[PDB]
RNA sequence: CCGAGGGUAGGGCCCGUGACUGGGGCGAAGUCGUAACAAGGUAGCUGUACCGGAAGGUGCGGCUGGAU
RNA sequence: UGGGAGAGGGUGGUGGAAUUCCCGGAGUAGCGGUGAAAUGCGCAGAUACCGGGAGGAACGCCGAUGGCGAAGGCAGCCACCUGGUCCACCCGUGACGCUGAGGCGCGAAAGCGUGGGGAGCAAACCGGAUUAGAUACCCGGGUAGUCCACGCCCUAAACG
RNA sequence: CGAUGUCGGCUCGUCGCAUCCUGGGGCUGAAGAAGGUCCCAAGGGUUGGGCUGUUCGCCCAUUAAAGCGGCACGCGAGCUG
RNA sequence: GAAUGCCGGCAUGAGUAACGAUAAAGAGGGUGAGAAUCCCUCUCGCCGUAAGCCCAAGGGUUCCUACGCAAUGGUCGUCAGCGUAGGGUUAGGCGGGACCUAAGGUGAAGCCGAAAGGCGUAGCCGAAGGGCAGCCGGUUAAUAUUCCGGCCCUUCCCGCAGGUGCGAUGGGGGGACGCUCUAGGCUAGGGGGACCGGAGCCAUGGACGAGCCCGGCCAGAAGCGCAGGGUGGGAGGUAGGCAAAUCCGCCUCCCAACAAGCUCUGCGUGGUGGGGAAGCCCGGGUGACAACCCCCCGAAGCCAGGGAGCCAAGAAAAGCCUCUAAGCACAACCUGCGGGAACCCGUACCGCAAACCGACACAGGUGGGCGGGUGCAAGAGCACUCAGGCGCGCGGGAGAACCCUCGCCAAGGAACUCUGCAAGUUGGCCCCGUAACUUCGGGAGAAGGGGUGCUCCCUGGGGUGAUGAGCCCCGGGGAGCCGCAGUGAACAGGCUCUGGCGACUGUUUACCAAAAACACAGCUCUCUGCGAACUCGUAAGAGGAGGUAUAGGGAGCGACGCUUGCCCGGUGCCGGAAGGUCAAGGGGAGGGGUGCAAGCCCCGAACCGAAGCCCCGGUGAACGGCGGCCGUAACUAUAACGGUCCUAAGGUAGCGAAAUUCCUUGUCGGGUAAGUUCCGACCUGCACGAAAAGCGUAACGACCGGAGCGCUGUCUCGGCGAGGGACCCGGUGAAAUUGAACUGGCCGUGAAGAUGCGGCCUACCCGUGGCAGGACGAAAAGACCCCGUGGAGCUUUACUGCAGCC
RNA sequence: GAGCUAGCCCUGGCCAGGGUGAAGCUGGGGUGAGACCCAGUGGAGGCCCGAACCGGUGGGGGAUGCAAACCCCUCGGAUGA
């Protein structure tokens, strides 16, 4: 049957990207956070 | 009038459509139509407000004349009659020598090629809009203004009217659709006669998906939900109100009175409203 | 081929009969009230409507086949 | 052809009396009701009186034993639209008449549908009396309905 | 109770005997035929339907007879539900 | 040494289950160390509204080639979407950007919030919508509307010529719109041809034929032709389109009017440029100087912004055109022509799937377009087939039980069973024919029947064309032929009678309930006078509504028909300028502490003093409630009738052993041979009853009950047959579980159900197919139940707060 | 976190074929005029049958599955909520 992942790079950009991160409180924590861990990526690749 | 149908569906058997029989013209003045933003019922939160909207007709929102007072003295002529979808009454294009036109509400009896015009000195005459203070006592009036320049307000709906019962200083004395007594300047602009479309409450909807295309969404009763939705949610089978009857949000809603306390109007209501 | 009739299926009319049920007629001496005949003790009757154990009552309109 | 009388019909308007309710004044110990009462209403200011407003329904005197209509029925007053009818003249048609099974239409009140209206009245209903009882008569309340429009019902002591 | 699936039916049997039938007996208020009652006897047999989830029971038509109980109210790692 | 402990390693089950659609395979040749599995050929089967083709998303080198085979591939592997390496994606015209706006988002102005931040007009962003210029063919191992060839076109810059009051974010026009039905003319696509081209072919009894087989086109500028869309012309006035305006709007006059004209599309033609089969012979070459013609069918596509009808009344903004303002009129714009200039990103490949989403090369999920032919009434249905693509990445045997899917069955025919569950039956079309009841529509495909192929003959009307032939589409009559059987295969209702419930079409517990539940038109009550009520928010602000009482909120009831009684004492709600109680505050009789004193400081009675509560009324389609004991009639029985107690008032109409009735399988009647169910009745209704509506109701229902007919393997009662498994052989090879085990029966004993204790009995060692009685077999630290001063959801006249409201 | 799912918003797309035959309109009858009747035309509908598409009624299979909801047969809607 239809399952949860319906992959769409423009959904995926506008949600977990970058720019939308840095829009937000939460946001920047989150960016903050993960780079203090040192996450190689800050945020999910996606192509465009 | 309206019209009925032969049962050859279930739902044809009660269904009643409006005559149209007054509409003169079959599509709107593009230079007063502006697209109208369906809601659902969402505001500016996207939250449901007003519960069971959406799915209706698209529609264009006819840009109405409510003030008049706009162009006293300039005479104009009623062009057509059309259907306005945002609207229980039917609206009437008008020509203005001018050669500006507009949209009014279109009162009882009016008919394409007469001609109106709005001002203190307008015969009393239906479609005629003056200020309150000029139009002799007893006559039915319609799109009535509640305060100066400020919009026309009450008895607008399909076949409404407001009757002038008596004067007072600034104020003359309304009874309003409702029936209620109300004070209201003399300066607010009304217009002579009652709304037209008088048959508009004789419809029967006849079946759900006409409902449906209003944007009515179907309505739940309290009864039908549970405990964590509705006062009356709840019950092992059918269950009877067992409380006061209440709205989802706890308040009575069998006879509480609501109108806020030492609201200012109130000096301005006379008698409150009958059956 | 037609064909007595036999068969299958579906209709129409009539008759008999049926748990139970509806009022009807009749029946020397039952129970309840007293509606009508006198102004019958609220004049009567009437079409209709609602009501009431029951006759009846009441409303609306009509008749005199009503009294004094 | 020329005249007349009429609550004959239909539509639109509009006038005053009265009841009710609301407002303001003035005023105080009862009012109402009955066979007698009680219920009811009234010092939270009623009844009675004055001024004001809203609203519905019915039209006093004229009015008659009268008039009109085929019957049912029709009564303030104005206008429009319309029917029947009588009289005068002796002008026209030349038996074109009478009745009328079916048909069609009209048809008081009550009742019914869909809207509106709602003062007064009032089935049902409630209360107070009366009574052995009183699902009545009498009293105090009161909903349909009575009113309007449209559509049904088609009854009668629709009787001379 | 860190689980012993819990009614009935179907299927499949098996056992007890306080025996429904069939076999053998005594007593009989046993003439005969047919019964009654007790004794011995478990080898075999002990039907098909209507009703109800039913067990049971009632009923229809038969029968030599249409037995009563146990087996975790036998049997859900056999089925049904 | 134990924690269903933690991490790891390795066992057991076991050479066991399985190896992923039952569409299907066989052989020859090749390659190679090795071949059922790679390559080639022939034969066979499968898909063909797909299992073929083309886009979009998503994926990201998976594409092509060479070299490989450890691992990946459910087996094998020489193969591969795998390993290494090299190569491969070309645009002014295709898509997106340098264009426009939609919801929404963001947001100079502004508003609001402890901070963070929430709003917000214009503006900006935002597309699969608008707008905008490329078609056909060739070419590569791999790209092609991109390269090449042919024929076309767009914008920007500059110049020339002609023309013109030129000039815009401003004004206006246009853009610009629904649903159903649909005209004419075309086009795509298709069928046929005795015509045209073509390598051939003659078999096996016949045919050298009007024989068979193959193919008979695609693109194209101007012009022309056909078919359509769009569009009145002139003048005078003018106060409106937030400046102006010659534009638009409005008014008048003249003219034009199904038109024509002007303009814009489609189709045809068209200089020209391409393509071009079977068969044959090694993707190629030949055919071939290939031919490229005629008739018919014909779109849902095109002309298109077409036409008609209807109500639920159907985006915006730019491009575009027109008007004018500052300006500027050596300018500028328009038209024609010429030269120059034209950027950024995508382009491979998969794409109903082995490359996307599902941990897998997973019988599942995935949006748009094309989707040929014949026959069956039609069709995207069904069968078979084209083009094209496949035989589903373990096989070979055997022919047990048993399981699955499938075929048949003597006699019987629901006797099966909770239930005809399941499976039969019926089945398309044409014709005849069709009942109660009904809201007059329906019920209705009611029911029930007849017809159905092929040949010959005569004949009716339509479409194309020409009026004819030809082709094509609907028919009518007559005479015959064959079979068991003519919708001969495939796809394609079993019917009826009668209750309950819900009016109906709809909706729902994604993944155990589709229903009688929810919704529904309709009915009623109630709130709301507009800065509405109500809702969301601390607010600002939104929704309500660019609505206005024929409107909007809340609540119940649920089409429709006939109806909806009595109780206002309690609770709620509504009304009530009195009285009662009532907080802060006002008041300040009278008290108190301190000081030598002026003073300072504290307590405090009467009294004035809201809402709320008390109190007085109203109110049921507001919460709700609607009795008991005793007596009585000229047979008996039973009480129309009476007595008395209590209540706020004592259940009306209708209905009733009911989706409600405990006793209960009530009693009677019907149906049956027999009926705890069913249907009709009765009424001592445990415990119906009137909008938590009462009683009905045509039509409807994958709802639930009862009956009959038809027909059946459901059954008496089982038999046989088919294929896929199970079994055997080669290949690959799991799992839950497992204290260790050398793991028998009885009768006992034992913590009360023993392979493991006692006493007897029985028993050589080890397996394989099978069956499920036991190992209180496995699975999941019982959901029931209890316990815990454990938790959470829900309720209220529990407690105490808080929002909100007063 | 609404790339699953629920509702609404904006913008696009899809629904083979066949059947029934509402209003209206035309003609005819009828009438004082009407209502109305008949025929033809017409093409309405939460209308009928049935693919795609959307569903998930009954049964069987599956149950360490092809699948953590699938497969076969049958069945509901299919111009509309
Ligand atoms: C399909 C595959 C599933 O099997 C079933 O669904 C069967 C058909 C259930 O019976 C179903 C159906 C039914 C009627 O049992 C037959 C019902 O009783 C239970 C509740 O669920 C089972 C076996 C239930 O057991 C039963 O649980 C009972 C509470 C007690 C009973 N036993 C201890 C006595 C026990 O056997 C239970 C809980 O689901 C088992 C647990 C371990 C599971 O969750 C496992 C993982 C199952 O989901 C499953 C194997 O995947
Ligand atoms: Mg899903
Ligand atoms: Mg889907
Ligand atoms: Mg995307
Ligand atoms: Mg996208
Ligand atoms: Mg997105
Ligand atoms: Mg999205
Ligand atoms: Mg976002
Ligand atoms: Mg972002
Ligand atoms: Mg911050
Ligand atoms: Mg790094
Ligand atoms: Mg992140
Ligand atoms: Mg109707
Ligand atoms: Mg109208
Ligand atoms: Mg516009
Ligand atoms: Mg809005
Ligand atoms: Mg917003
Ligand atoms: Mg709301
Ligand atoms: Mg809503
Ligand atoms: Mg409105
Ligand atoms: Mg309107
Ligand atoms: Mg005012
Ligand atoms: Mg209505
Ligand atoms: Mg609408
Ligand atoms: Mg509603
Ligand atoms: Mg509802
Ligand atoms: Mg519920
Ligand atoms: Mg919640
Ligand atoms: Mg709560
Ligand atoms: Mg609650
Ligand atoms: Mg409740
Ligand atoms: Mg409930
Ligand atoms: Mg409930
Ligand atoms: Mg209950
Ligand atoms: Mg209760
Ligand atoms: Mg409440
Ligand atoms: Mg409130
Ligand atoms: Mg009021
Ligand atoms: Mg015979
Ligand atoms: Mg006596
Ligand atoms: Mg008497
Ligand atoms: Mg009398
Ligand atoms: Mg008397
Ligand atoms: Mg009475
Ligand atoms: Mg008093
Ligand atoms: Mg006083
Ligand atoms: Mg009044
Ligand atoms: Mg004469
Ligand atoms: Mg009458
Ligand atoms: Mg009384
Ligand atoms: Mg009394
Ligand atoms: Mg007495
Ligand atoms: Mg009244
Ligand atoms: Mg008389
Ligand atoms: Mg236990
Ligand atoms: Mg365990
Ligand atoms: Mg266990
Ligand atoms: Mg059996
Ligand atoms: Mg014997
Ligand atoms: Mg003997
Ligand atoms: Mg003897
Ligand atoms: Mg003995
Ligand atoms: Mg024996
Ligand atoms: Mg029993
Ligand atoms: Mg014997
Ligand atoms: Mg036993
Ligand atoms: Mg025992
Ligand atoms: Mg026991
Ligand atoms: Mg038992
Ligand atoms: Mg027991
Ligand atoms: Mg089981
Ligand atoms: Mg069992
Ligand atoms: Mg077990
Ligand atoms: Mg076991
Ligand atoms: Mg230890
Ligand atoms: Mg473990
Ligand atoms: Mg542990
Ligand atoms: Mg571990
Ligand atoms: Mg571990
Ligand atoms: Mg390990
Ligand atoms: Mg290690
Ligand atoms: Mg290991
Ligand atoms: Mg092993
Ligand atoms: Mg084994
Ligand atoms: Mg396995
Ligand atoms: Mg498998
Ligand atoms: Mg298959
Ligand atoms: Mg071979
Ligand atoms: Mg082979
Ligand atoms: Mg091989
Ligand atoms: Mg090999
Ligand atoms: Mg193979
Ligand atoms: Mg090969
Ligand atoms: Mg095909
Ligand atoms: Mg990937
Ligand atoms: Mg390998
Ligand atoms: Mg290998
Ligand atoms: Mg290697
Ligand atoms: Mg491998
Ligand atoms: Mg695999
Ligand atoms: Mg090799
Ligand atoms: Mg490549
Ligand atoms: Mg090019
Ligand atoms: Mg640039
Ligand atoms: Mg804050
Ligand atoms: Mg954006
Ligand atoms: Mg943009
Ligand atoms: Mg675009
Ligand atoms: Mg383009
Ligand atoms: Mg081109
Ligand atoms: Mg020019
Ligand atoms: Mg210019
Ligand atoms: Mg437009
Ligand atoms: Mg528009
Ligand atoms: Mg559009
Ligand atoms: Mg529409
Ligand atoms: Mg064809
Ligand atoms: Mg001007
Ligand atoms: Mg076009
Ligand atoms: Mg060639
Ligand atoms: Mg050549
Ligand atoms: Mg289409
Ligand atoms: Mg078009
Ligand atoms: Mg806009
Ligand atoms: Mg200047
Ligand atoms: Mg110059
Ligand atoms: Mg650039
Ligand atoms: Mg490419
Ligand atoms: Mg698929
Ligand atoms: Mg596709
Ligand atoms: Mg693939
Ligand atoms: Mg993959
Ligand atoms: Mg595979
Ligand atoms: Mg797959
Ligand atoms: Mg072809
Ligand atoms: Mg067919
Ligand atoms: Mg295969
Ligand atoms: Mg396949
Ligand atoms: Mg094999
Ligand atoms: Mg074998
Ligand atoms: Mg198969
Ligand atoms: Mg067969
Ligand atoms: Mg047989
Ligand atoms: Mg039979
Ligand atoms: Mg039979
Ligand atoms: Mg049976
Ligand atoms: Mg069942
Ligand atoms: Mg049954
Ligand atoms: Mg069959
Ligand atoms: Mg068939
Ligand atoms: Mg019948
Ligand atoms: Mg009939
Ligand atoms: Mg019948
Ligand atoms: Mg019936
Ligand atoms: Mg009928
Ligand atoms: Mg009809
Ligand atoms: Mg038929
Ligand atoms: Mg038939
Ligand atoms: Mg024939
Ligand atoms: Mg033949
Ligand atoms: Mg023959
Ligand atoms: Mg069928
Ligand atoms: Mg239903
Ligand atoms: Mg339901
Ligand atoms: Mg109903
Ligand atoms: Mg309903
Ligand atoms: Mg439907
Ligand atoms: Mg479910
Ligand atoms: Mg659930
Ligand atoms: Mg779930
Ligand atoms: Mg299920
Ligand atoms: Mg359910
Ligand atoms: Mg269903
Ligand atoms: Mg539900
Ligand atoms: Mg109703
Ligand atoms: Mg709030
Ligand atoms: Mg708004
Ligand atoms: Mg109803
Ligand atoms: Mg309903
Ligand atoms: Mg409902
Ligand atoms: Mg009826
Ligand atoms: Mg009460
Ligand atoms: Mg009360
Ligand atoms: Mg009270
Ligand atoms: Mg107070
Ligand atoms: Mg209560
Ligand atoms: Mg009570
Ligand atoms: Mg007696
Ligand atoms: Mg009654
Ligand atoms: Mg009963
Ligand atoms: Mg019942
Ligand atoms: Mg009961
Ligand atoms: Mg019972
Ligand atoms: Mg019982
Ligand atoms: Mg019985
Ligand atoms: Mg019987
Ligand atoms: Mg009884
Ligand atoms: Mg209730
Ligand atoms: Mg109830
Ligand atoms: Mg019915
Ligand atoms: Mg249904
Ligand atoms: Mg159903
Ligand atoms: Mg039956
Ligand atoms: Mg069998
Ligand atoms: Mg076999
Ligand atoms: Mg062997
Ligand atoms: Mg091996
Ligand atoms: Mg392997
Ligand atoms: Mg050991
Ligand atoms: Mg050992
Ligand atoms: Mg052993
Ligand atoms: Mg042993
Ligand atoms: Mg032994
Ligand atoms: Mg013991
Ligand atoms: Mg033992
Ligand atoms: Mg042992
Ligand atoms: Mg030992
Ligand atoms: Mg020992
Ligand atoms: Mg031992
Ligand atoms: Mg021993
Ligand atoms: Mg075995
Ligand atoms: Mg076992
Ligand atoms: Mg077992
Ligand atoms: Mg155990
Ligand atoms: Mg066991
Ligand atoms: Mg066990
Ligand atoms: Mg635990
Ligand atoms: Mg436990
Ligand atoms: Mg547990
Ligand atoms: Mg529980
Ligand atoms: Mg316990
Ligand atoms: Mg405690
Ligand atoms: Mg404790
Ligand atoms: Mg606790
Ligand atoms: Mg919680
Ligand atoms: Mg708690
Ligand atoms: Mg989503
Ligand atoms: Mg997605
Ligand atoms: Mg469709
Ligand atoms: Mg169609
Ligand atoms: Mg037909
Ligand atoms: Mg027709
Ligand atoms: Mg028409
Ligand atoms: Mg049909
Ligand atoms: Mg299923
Ligand atoms: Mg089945
Ligand atoms: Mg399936
Ligand atoms: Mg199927
Ligand atoms: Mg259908
Ligand atoms: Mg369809």
Avoid at chain 2, 20 to 48: A, C, D, H, M, Y
Avoid at chain 2, 148 to 158: D, I, Y
Avoid at chain 2, 234 to 249: C, F, L, N, V
């Amino acid at each position: 049957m239809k399952r949860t992942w319906q992959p769409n790079r423009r959904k995926r950009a506008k949600t977990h990207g970058f720019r939308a991160r840095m829009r937000t409180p939460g946001g920047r924590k989150v960016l903050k956070r993960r780079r203090q861990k040192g996450r190689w990526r800050l945020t999910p690749a996606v192509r465009k | 009038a309206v019209k009925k149908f032969k049962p050859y569906t279930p739902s044809r058997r009660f269904m009643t459509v409006a005559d149209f029989s007054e509409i003169t013209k079959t599509e709107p003045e593009k230079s007063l139509v502006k697209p109208l933003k369906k809601t659902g019922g969402r505001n500016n939160q996207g939250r449901i407000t007003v519960r069971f909207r959406g799915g209706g007709h698209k529609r264009l929102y006819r840009i109405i004349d409510f003030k008049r007072w706009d162009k006293v003295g300039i005479p104009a002529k009623v062009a057509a009659i059309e259907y306005d979808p945002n609207r229980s009454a039917r609206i009437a294009l008008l020509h203005y020598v001018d050669g500006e036109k507009r949209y009014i509400i279109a009162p009882d009896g009016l008919q394409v090629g007469q001609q109106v015009v709005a001002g203190p000195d307008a015969p009393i005459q239906v479609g005629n809009a003056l200020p309150l203070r000029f139009i002799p006592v007893g006559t039915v009036v319609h799109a009535v203004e509640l305060e100066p320049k400020k919009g026309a307000k009450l008895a607008r709906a399909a076949g409404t009217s407001a009757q002038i019962q008596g004067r007072e200083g600034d104020y003359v004395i309304l009874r309003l659709p409702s029936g209620e007594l109300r004070k209201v300047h003399g300066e607010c602009y009304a217009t002579v006669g009652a709304v037209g479309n008088a048959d508009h409450k004789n419809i029967v909807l006849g079946k759900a998906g006409r409902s449906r295309w209003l944007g009515r969404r179907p309505h739940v009763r309290g009864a039908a939900m549970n405990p964590v939705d509705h006062p009356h949610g709840g019950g092992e089978g059918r269950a009877p109100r067992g409380r006061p009857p209440a709205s989802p949000w706890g308040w009575q809603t069998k006879g509480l009175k609501t109108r806020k306390r030492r609201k200012p109007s109130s000096r301005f209501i006379i008698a409150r409203r009958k059956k």
